[PDB]
Amino acid sequence: TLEEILEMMEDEEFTPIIPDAVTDYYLAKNGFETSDIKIKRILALATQKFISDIAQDAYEYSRIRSSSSNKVVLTMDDLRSALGEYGINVKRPNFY
């Protein structure tokens, strides 16, 4: 539902990977102070989820690359494709 979701963030049973201090810094940067702890953990959580989504995009787009049916590296082609499929813009690096 929704009210369970702020029943749960308060206690230690669900404490986002993003530490409280770092999110406090980024709240403060973009201009928000409040003496609640829920909301900050919540924005932490949503960001965690969004990065998880690009993670799975990268995983699958790496899994297509060869042999469908010296370890794994998430390179610039994998990233070029997933970031592109979002709205993140074109990565056209170069040399010379």
Partner: protein, 154 residues
Amino acid sequence: GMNKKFNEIIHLMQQIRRICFKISLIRQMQTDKLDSDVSYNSLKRSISKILMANGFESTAPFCSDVITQIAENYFGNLVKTLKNHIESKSINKVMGDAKFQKVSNKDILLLSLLENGVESPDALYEYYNENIVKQISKLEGLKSRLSSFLAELL
């Protein structure tokens, strides 16, 4: 830090099972006020702790910087949304003379979530259970591979 603890359990199981995967390949083919830089690098730590998929910081560094900056932008976009709704200076928002908030303090939050990314609240409940199920799913997949390889080596 139960979320940190479970992501760490994912990390440990990944380490051990990927190690076992690699040696099995080897045997088969045998035959507080804080500052900017600390914040950045803490976020990089947390990021590369997300990455159960590939390998924890097992990619080029440019990509780590990329990811850091992107998630920074996203978090900023969250807060720029909520504070914009809160200032509002519009009749739809703004405490009414008779204390009538057309939309109370919570719909603001639900709404700012909605504008950026997440659609509904319970998608978070969903992603959470999805995470813990990903743990046991990949666990059991590579554990069955482990048992079958223990059978195969004989």
